[PDB]
Symmetry: C6
Subunit: 217 residues, 6 copies
């Protein structure tokens, strides 16, 4: 990554073994549960494109997902190039060249180039632009791999309301409803069991989740 040292300058630091292992193990344990995305983002704090590729490339399973992610990346890289075309032919000697989509994705740019963009004044934050693309991809995968429709999360007749709500919002998070506060006074009540539904209906509209959860305790 690029870090500030103990004296203020932005400099390159090797990716730690700790970071490398943390990311690999989160994917091993959680696959594409939605909580993997914020973890990915945090573990990739300060990352260069190189570092991003390293993290992705260290994943051994899930190669259908990694291939889908390459595809998303390629789509975002092609839109980058449409928005910001680069002058072809030879670069002014010693000068910074402008990044293309593939340079941002770290496939046709060197670490040194990446460091130059990222630390230039003003900076071209290639690592953050690429991260956004990867996260866009990752979110598609989380949605695709969501195993259950929100329509099938219904409270069991003996199921504690809290366990139902946990299932419902974990499902909603994966399906990626933006709806989130919203769905509360509608689908969540509809999919509640008969006894709880009666209670919740009686509360009247505008009930907070806390209120709903106390009511159905």
């Amino acid at each position: 990554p690029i870090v500030q040292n103990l004296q203020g300058q932005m400099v390159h630091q090797c990716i730690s073994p700790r970071t490398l292992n943390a990311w690999v193990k989160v994917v091993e344990e959680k696959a594409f549960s939605p909580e993997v995305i914020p973890m990915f983002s945090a573990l990739s704090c300060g990352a260069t494109p190189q570092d991003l590729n390293t993290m992705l490339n260290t994943v051994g399973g899930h190669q259908a997902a990694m291939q889908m992610l390459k595809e998303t990346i390629n789509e975002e890289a092609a839109e980058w190039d449409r928005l910001h075309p680069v002058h072809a032919g030879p670069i002014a000697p010693g000068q910074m060249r402008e990044p293309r989509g593939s340079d941002i994705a770290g496939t046709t740019s060197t670490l040194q180039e990446q460091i130059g963009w990222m630390t230039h004044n003003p900076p071209i934050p290639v690592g953050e632009i690429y991260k956004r693309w990867i996260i866009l991809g990752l979110n598609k995968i989380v949605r695709m791999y969501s195993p259950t429709s929100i329509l099938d999360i219904r409270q069991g007749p003996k199921e504690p309301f809290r366990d139902y709500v946990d299932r419902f919002y974990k499902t909603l998070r994966a399906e990626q409803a933006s709806v989130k506060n919203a769905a509360t006074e509608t689908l969540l009540v509809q999919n509640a069991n008969p006894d709880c539904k009666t209670i919740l209906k009686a509360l009247g509209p505008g009930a907070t989740l806390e209120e709903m959860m106390t009511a159905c305790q």
Copy 2:
């Protein structure tokens, strides 16, 4: 987080993998036992709003609680805005803008903005203001998820007084009696078993817990 380096300046540091993992595992092991709150506070030492959101967002279960927490956050953000409205329209070029509730919660502010507030002279401690909101939320959840009323913590006929007292104060902590020294010379004696109650009554009022615990040994 924002830290002081080895030379005195306040600067941004990536959240560690160690920190990230510690928080995720505490929630996995302890759920919303009350001791999770001081741990959260300590693990979030120096946090920006971004860092706070990261920590929250890395939690995979308990999505009923995380949704209740968003709600509390939204309530505190709306009261922030009532207390400190911000001039609308365009900001003076290059100048610091004033934070709104959603900026404090990290949803409409950038890391750079956050860093500027937090390190400005005088500082606007957005990370500490947000932390207070999250802790307010978290405390509601701890109370809600407390499984037993203090009224049901009564000493077993064969139950060591110390184990009873441990149960009683662990329950009181979750229910969040402010009462804490208080409840000592009342409910704790009332809920003691017949033999211990007799002993404790004989001690007279004003007995310290230590005295009570020795007496009922």
Copy 3:
């Protein structure tokens, strides 16, 4: 804690995850065995009052003990205030105020105040004063939770002398005899089994523990 950096100034550092976890796990594994106290002291090296409270507050069990400890703290805080009363009414603008008992215990003082006391010239070592109070409390708990009287530690007829001595001094440590060198040429011999007692009596007085242990091998 407050640490010296790599350039000589005293500055605040966040409590580490490593420290936090170490303390929680020692309490989980060892409860109030006497060796927990020196560990607590060492893990709290450089601690502010805030840090002390964090460590205490992260303990999830043993709430009878934590309540007894609050009580001891309150007693020491009240004696602090008797010894060092503070001028009431408004503080000189910008100046350091004097700490009261509750400020030392971190309940009515801010981190910033604490840092100011601890790094002032001359310093008011609030973290060390509070630590002393907590250790006084903790020692009471270790004594209370000692499961066996020294009077009941007697050598088994088939019990190796070394295992007996280990039991005897582990018990004495918990009961907190100051006696420690002392009890050696008396109770330790008295509570030895018949064969070893005969041997030890023959050695004559003034025998070192090493001498006793060789003799009864």
Copy 4:
């Protein structure tokens, strides 16, 4: 490795125990699965030739592979020497000598020499040149140890399409098809089971993997 310190100069740092252990354990757990290569590259960030040899030499099993890797190294070293022959006889006193193939591979050069090349202006990046050779070798091994031909990865009649695709791209990665986006609209469909193949044929050409995977859900 060679790192930049907290003040800007490039200096030698001992390889960490953490790094050493991470590499040894990845090889123990994953052998020559293709994801070991990006891990190797990342763990060897900043490595000198010495460090590269250390990492390789710490591997205890797989000595057929390590011998094949020496062979590849020797081939690349011999081509280095063909491209960049070095003046024989005695070196100018105090001056940097030019590296030969074996110097780049760390077998006839000292750490000090290596440090001098790597930090000279302009640098001779011996550690990166050697790393490229090792990775060339390693890729040959990954291909050789790939257990299954892509021709034998065919979807089971009851096999979820996603699990098939995972098998297919994991196999392709090992066999090292450059084809990767390519093989998607051909072999992947051909090797799909009858029901999925029918669905995929109906989609028409140009289907993205995401589209294919949704279709065969």
Copy 5:
């Protein structure tokens, strides 16, 4: 401990959790096997007397040994005082006082005093003087707790010579023969089994251990 920082000055650093845990666990796993002593010495690198006491005091078992160690310490402290008596009565204001035995053992000296001695020019290395005393004590314990006389380490009729030699030198190390090279051409041969003894006798005198071990393979 007292360390040199990244700028050359000697300063106090808190004992790490890592160090604390390492020492406690070595004692738990190995008790007073002789290899614990060099580990103790290395873990206590740079230690103040305070730090030494911390490490000792964190040990929960083995209290017979810890008491024997206090005794040794007291003996060395009393000889210190015989060799280096200190002027009684009040110290020159602001000046360094001279350490007594108990100051060196950290029982009547403050951390600040200890730091002053250790970093004075010229230094009074109180931490190293105390460490020597503790190691003297520890060595007595290792010898006392050695379970087997060297006289009882004899090669089994089916026992590989190498396993015998391992037993013999592990025993000798505990009993603390200075003899070590020595005992090689005598007791080690005497205690060898009949077939190996014959072989070894034939080698003639002056055989190296390597030679002996090859011979009896």
Copy 6:
């Protein structure tokens, strides 16, 4: 060890707990498999003689080997003294004395002396000279403890060629053939099973290992 800090000067640093534990555990897990030697070398990066002795002395088993290693050390120390005799009698006040064999092995020199040699201009690299001696010793032990002659590594009739080759080069590494590329087109083919031998003979001479391994797949 002696390290360069964050400002360029060579200074002493305590051996880490991490390093100490890593070395002890490698010996526990792998004994004297040949891969222990490069690990030892890497873990001892920057070591003083003191540090080298620490690492060796922390090993609890294998005392036959540790004794053989002392012997090798003594032999190298005696040859050092033959090559570089030192002027006897008193040293010039304040000046660096010249190291003898035993000073290099850390038995008659202080840490301070060692630091002075190692950081003098020009340096006397006592830690690297001693390391070379220890590695010479260690290599003798690896060879001695090799359990199988290369002559007995022959491919099983049902044994995959790759597993045979792994056995053969792991054995050769321990026996310490310099032969290594060499033995490839001879003994390795000779010790192959009948079917593979026929295949390999047909390839003709000059086959690379890769070629051999593909052929016998």
